[PDB]
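Standup notes
- HV: blocked on the assembly model, inputs below
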Amino acid sequence: TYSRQIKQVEDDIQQLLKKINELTGIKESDTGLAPPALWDLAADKQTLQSEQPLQVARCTKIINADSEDPKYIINVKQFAKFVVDLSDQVAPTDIEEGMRVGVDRNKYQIHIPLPPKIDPTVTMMQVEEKPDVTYSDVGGCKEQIEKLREVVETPLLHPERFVNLGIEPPKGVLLFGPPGTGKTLCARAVANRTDACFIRVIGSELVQKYVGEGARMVRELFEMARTKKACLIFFDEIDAIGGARFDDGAGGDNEVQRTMLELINQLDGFDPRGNIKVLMATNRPDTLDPALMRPGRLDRKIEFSLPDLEGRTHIFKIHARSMSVERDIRFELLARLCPNSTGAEIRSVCTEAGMFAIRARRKIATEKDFLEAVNKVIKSYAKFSATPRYMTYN
Amino acid sequence: ASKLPLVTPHTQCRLKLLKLERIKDYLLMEEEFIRNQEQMKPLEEKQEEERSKVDDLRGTPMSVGTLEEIIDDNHAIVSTSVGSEHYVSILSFVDKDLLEPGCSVLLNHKVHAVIGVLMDDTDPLVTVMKVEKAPQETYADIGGLDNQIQEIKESVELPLTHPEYYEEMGIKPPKGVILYGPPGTGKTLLAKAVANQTSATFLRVVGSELIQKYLGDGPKLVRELFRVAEEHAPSIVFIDEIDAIGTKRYDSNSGGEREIQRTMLELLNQLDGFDSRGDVKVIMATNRIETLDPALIRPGRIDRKIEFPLPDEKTKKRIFQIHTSRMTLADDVTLDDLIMAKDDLSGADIKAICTEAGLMALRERRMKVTNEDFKKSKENVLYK
Amino acid sequence: TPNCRVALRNDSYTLHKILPNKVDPLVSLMMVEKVPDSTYEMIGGLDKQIKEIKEVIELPVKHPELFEALGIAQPKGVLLYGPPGTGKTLLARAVAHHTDCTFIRVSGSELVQKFIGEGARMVRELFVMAREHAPSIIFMDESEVQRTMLELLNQLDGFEATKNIKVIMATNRIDILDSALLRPGRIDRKIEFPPPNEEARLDILKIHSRKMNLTRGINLRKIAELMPGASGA
Amino acid sequence: MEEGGRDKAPVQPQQSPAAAPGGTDEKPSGKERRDAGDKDKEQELSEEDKQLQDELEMLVERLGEKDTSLYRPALEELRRQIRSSTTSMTSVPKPLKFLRPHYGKLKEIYENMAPGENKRFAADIISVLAMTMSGERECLKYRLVGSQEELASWGHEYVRHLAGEVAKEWQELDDAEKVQREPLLTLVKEIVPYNMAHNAEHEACDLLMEIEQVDMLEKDIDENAYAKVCLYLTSCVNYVPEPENSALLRCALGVFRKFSRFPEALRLALMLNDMELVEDIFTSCKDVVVQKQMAFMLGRHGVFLELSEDVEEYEDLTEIMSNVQLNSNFLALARELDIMEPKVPDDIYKTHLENNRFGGSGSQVDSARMNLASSFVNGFVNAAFGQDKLLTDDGNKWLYKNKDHGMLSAAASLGMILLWDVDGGLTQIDKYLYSSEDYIKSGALLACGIVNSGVRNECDPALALLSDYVLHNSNTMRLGSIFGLGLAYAGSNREDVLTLLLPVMGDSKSSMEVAGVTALACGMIAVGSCNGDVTSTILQTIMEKSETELKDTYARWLPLGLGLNHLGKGEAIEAILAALEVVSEPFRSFANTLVDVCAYAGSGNVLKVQQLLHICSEHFDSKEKEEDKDKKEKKDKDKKEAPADMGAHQGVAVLGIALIAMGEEIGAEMALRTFGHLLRYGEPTLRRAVPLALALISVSNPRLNILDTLSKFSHDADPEVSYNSIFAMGMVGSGTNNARLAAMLRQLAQYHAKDPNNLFMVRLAQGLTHLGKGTLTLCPYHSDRQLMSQVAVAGLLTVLVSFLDVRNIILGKSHYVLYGLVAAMQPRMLVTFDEELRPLPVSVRVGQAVDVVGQAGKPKTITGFQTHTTPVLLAHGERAELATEEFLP
Ligand SMILES: Nc1ncnc2c1ncn2[C@@H]1O[C@H](COP(=O)(O)OP(=O)(O)OP(=O)(O)O)[C@@H](O)[C@H]1O
Ligand SMILES: Nc1ncnc2c1ncn2[C@@H]1O[C@H](COP(=O)(O)OP(=O)(O)OP(=O)(O)O)[C@@H](O)[C@H]1O
Ligand SMILES: Nc1ncnc2c1ncn2[C@@H]1O[C@H](COP(=O)(O)OP(=O)(O)O)[C@@H](O)[C@H]1O
Ligand SMILES: [Mg+2]
Ligand SMILES: [Mg+2]
């Protein structure tokens, strides 16, 4: 009824919000500047306080000390080397050799030790954040879930039942099967439930242009692994990181083999890694080198096969619990119609048959809509099917 | 800016009056609230006194730095342009959230302390493969197919335009879409139609140019590619001719097939990574569908498989009707004789015969196209 | 302006003055390559091929509307073929020289590389300089050339809106290139270059015999018969 | 340009109305038959809403407007039929014949005469006939008439029936979504006196439709979520009889007339309590309506069900009182022990593990104030039947060591361990009560008042805490004996023990740590009447607060219980009653805003808010009334939790620009508690904006303001992924932000969200706009956190057990008589529907479907399937009886 009276009372304050917030100051879309009233701690004090008593303290690297005297041999990025001194702010204890320290620009003396260098693309692959996959969603392979879980988390969540028995639990485990079987999806639940550093590694991220370049990434990776108390290291598609050694004539594929041998040395012998747990995942496990296949690195060897009948029905109950359906259908008929099938294929059946409900104008799918999914996904897409040479893994 | 997203009465109501009247009171309260500050305390003006004081802090030479670590009490190790890195402190007008490892900042000239960050410039790779505008005409240009058009709108367009149908259903859209058939059947043409249709960001890359001459630059290019595709919005990633990564070998590749393989491994990760993917759609096309790795083809990574047949003759006459629409056609010609000239001709062949016939018209400067233009036009196009 | 040299003071780095412009990287590129610039006046007896290439390239610049008079799309791809030494480079240089287009060949070299970019992970980064010299023509010699041309034609099949950008490939023995390149919806016109006959050797003797200090009475017809038609070189 | 040819309507309506002054006089047939030809042709050629560009309605008034102005007024012999041919033609195009000053001259065509039965030519047409014109009547015409001319002539008397029949035309044409225009006609009509138009459309709404009750019923309470004092006073008591007179849905009475309880009349919800006790059907809906009367939004009802039919249905009152409270116990007796909860989870202190090797060594923090937080390893994790047998040794060996308020604290944690209990909570205290200690007996008997929270059976009317009170000549025997009785009997309205606690205020004892929380204890009991409590407060306030100029022991404790005793009404009398009561010097006029705005918790009266921040904006205040302006912002912390997303964005968008951004003391010291009184849940728009001012501690201020916002920021329940944002701040909190004043504070912050794996619904929003108190149990701690002198000595009474109105968690409850059903539910997001197509799409979060007692969450709306039909209460209320019916084969 009051067409202008609602409209101008709307509009004058929808503009006047800007007309007073300009008077406050949120404007001048920056080039890298703060909100104008957040830096007010450094309005006056830290302008002449974080700058005028403070200095650059350029960071360096220790070569070695000497006896009887400090006389520290220092090193910098490009420039020369010096024989430097402490400050009074430090004891000479934690000024150990091969260490980064912060050093003033004029006297060239040492202020504070630093954490060492970490290569940045190794820092990127720390996960920092967790997915949402719950162990309810990996239904069908419960014995594999338990046999994995007893290695992964039980010494971490309970480091007393193994100690008071007097056993060292296994530290290595690989996971393998056909594609789409639930390996990576099974790992996402591990990343869900876990609490420590879950450092993921995909093997194709380690192929580098320079010679031996990836091996140093492996080294620094296990360095920051050894910095933490407990840590989980995830490996995916390790056929790229190594098959075997087969060189002949023109020696090819060597650069992968050097990084793989470095991974071997970082896994076993000569300062063992301690509380670091690894986890591999491949598609075809036959190509792998047997020294990598040696236990002590790859203890648990979990098979992933297709579910028998009941695991398949359970997968139907997982992917099919959350969609508007006819109530009185049965899934066991569908699991009879899918002898050899993965949970990905079953998910494509459910998510396809919902689209069969969206075909004409229905809101709840039917059993014959499921039948229209089965012949298409199984039998019409049955030309490709992706499975059988991966059943023999060749 | 983001002040009241509640617009749901959508009428002349006392609610929509009072929403503003309340916010009218709050914001007049903020006006006369701050009005005492510039009348009572003009010591700091806060429009140019504090900002000019920041500009008095920062020097006029503003050196550009590089981030590699963060220590939280506003000092960090930052890299110089030469490489001789420092351990400077960070100021407080520095908006402590954009700072990531590898980011570029602004340093002091004197003590090299972190003045601010810099919103870094783009385009090394983004505007190479980002599609600028709508390429061509609409789905009415296609004709004759009419079924897989519903399939592609089904998997791609409808989840965008109607995000209610899947939520009333309890379902997510199918992930992967692949195209295959004989060459010249309109695989790229349908992608032009979708690129006309959509509103999301659209990315296109040939499957040939995935390969590199340096080792690992392939999979690195893959990782930064899906980085770029993820970081913007709900986009559409198009890949044409992905057989060519498997068919041809090039001597610029210092690696053999066991580097192409590793590129396909990293790509195989980037379709179905354990990471949260996001609103990214994948559309693929080839003609040798039998050659490539089926682990890429499995449901879960590619859901919908779409065959393109050769056109039937009633679709062929429709395609003749399309490509002979806006041309001055003399009545000498009969399209039906032109239909059965080749038993398995394509729309590209039809368009080639039409355009080459127009070239035969322009050789003789004419405007209409005669029959013998088509008679020698099929001789030029077809047989050699 | 972006990408311009300036003068700069040193104490406070205040911007002093704008200096002269940087040389264009395309100009430095062609200065590196040094194609033999040519004209119609040094063509020996190829006039029907001239009439073909005028129809292909000369028309969709000076008369783009003339294709809208017929309702057909404009051609984009040219394949020249014939034995080497038969005028391919001078012809393709000459056409752009007369229609005033930026003759930009590509070789896949790496001295050229620093002017395209630091790596130029595609060929497609060339298109910035191409549409920056928008009435331009791309030239190619004789498998990386063959994939590169496919990467060009997949862009300018409708994915690039800027016109007046055309590509030209020259080779011999047309049957040994790609069948996907031999898809009939791809190549717009293919032009054969034959070896010269006794007529078409005499005029190359005429044009080429211009800069020499001759003697009166030469009878180039006899010498043109003495050469049994190898090529123009 | 296709003109001419078909010009019949720009020619014959151009000629015959032009020949009408030449055919009015001396042509009596041409006056009327051409006017009838101008009535049926403009009528029938103007009914269709497809050709809205009519051929006369924007065509004839090039000459027919001056012809109308020289036709109706300038004729002066307008008879009884030619007004029906004249004013039925000249009234149809007149909102578009005239320009925008039509509003004062709709009457110069219509009020000459309304022609006959005006809806006869407004039958087919929707809103271009007169509904827009009637909007021009009720917009300006009935505003100028009904400003001070309500009881009047034709400008009201016919306007009631005209605005009645138009409103029947809205629910007569289509039954579209134009039904909600009837609140926009009945409400725009006589804005303040809404009752007289609600008389004109309430019985028409009774005869309107039964299906068209719910969306306009939601539209009316949508218009009643926030309103002016008289329109919320009027449209809500008009909103009450709609599912009582017209509809028989009748189970949404008590939870939605708690809306209509306080500002209208305190006896109105008692007459609606009678309306509960009259519809005596069976027991399902009768049961479920009276379920909420004990521990879901109110108390003070347990003397009203002792009628003459005490067998089982009027013996429901004992079951309401303690047996469904015992079902709230049964949530943790069965339904929490079955899912996850062991007797000692205990491992968040074990989650504090990794700082020994994260950068150096450990075994360094050995402060005795760490043990104050280490008693909450016992205290916080053990709520909801987390009972402990010799697992209270962290409170046992610290109970006999030092820290007298820690001897109160470890003895007071047992009440937080045994919550909602009457069965053995008095027996678990006595094993550690007998210690002969002023602090152990007072904290333990203080916990006795905590265990019986919500019971109000025979535990302590004058039994235990009165015996704790009568020992007094000293410390917390005097103090902690009045706290638990106002705590447990805070939901009670009993006057007798209020007059046992009235000589505590009337003592005028110098123990001001007792006399201050006396107002906080008696304020929690009463919210309405008994002005003698307010007299007892103001008399000691004049005897003690006047002859001094000292600390906020007075200011934080004494007027706050007066705001409790005058909470919740919009009438603006109580501000006159208490603001003119202690008219005084400004340190005693600290209580200006207390009773003023404590009456105004959730409403819309933002004119109060401009007279709440225009008086003292900054004034530069050289240490003068920074506490009064911090309290002036403390009373900005209402109005924002429930205007249904109206002021929350306008508090994060105004206070983050105003006070913590551009202030000196209010923002730097205090103005973050709006995010601790506004919310308890959490969204990242401020959840990732407060650690910009927290993780930057900026110790240049009195840094225990920022450390006060550490644990307070952590005030948010419903536990989250915030262990990074808190454990990082305790990781830098190991070295920095020292443990000498904060070792209780960082682990107090960490343990606060996830004490248990449930019990957090404390947000004063259980369902929708539900109040459910707390506004008495939650407020005095946020008023108590002034700045200091209470982190060590005095505030250890309130920092443990301040808020204890935790009405549990869940809504997934069967409550069958046998209790055999589990559920058939489907949890989703909060709804978005206001008006849409048919089955209004409710919400969009279909991806979750359970059938068990699982988690609730804040923005959740839950429905079902199976044709269970859920016919009990149908909206919200978390104790659905869950009957079923199968008239759907
Ligand atoms: N037990 C299961 N229950 C439900 N879904 C499953 C199960 N196993 C597999 N899936 C489905 O299969 C899909 C693929 O999972 P995942 O990525 O782990 O396959 P994979 O075994 O790692 O093989 P690939 O290495 O090819 O991915 C997942 O999206 C998941 O939904
Ligand atoms: N069904 C059709 N209707 C109309 N035009 C068509 C059709 N099929 C092909 N064309 C024409 O053929 C040309 C080539 O189309 P397109 O390149 O998309 O086919 P393609 O199968 O993608 O070929 P390639 O196998 O080389 O990728 C298009 O320009 C289009 O005009
Ligand atoms: N028709 C011709 N007229 C004159 N000179 C020619 C002709 N054909 C080739 N040449 C000579 O051949 C050389 C260029 O070879 P060309 O055929 O253009 O490139 P390519 O041999 O790489 O295809 C020039 O030096 C030119 O003098
Ligand atoms: Mg996988
Ligand atoms: Mg194609």
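- HV (later): unblocked. Chain B touches chain A through 89 residues (CB under 8 Å). The pocket of magnesium ion (ligand 4) is lined by residues A 183-184 (CB under 6 Å).
- Next: hand off to the docking folks.
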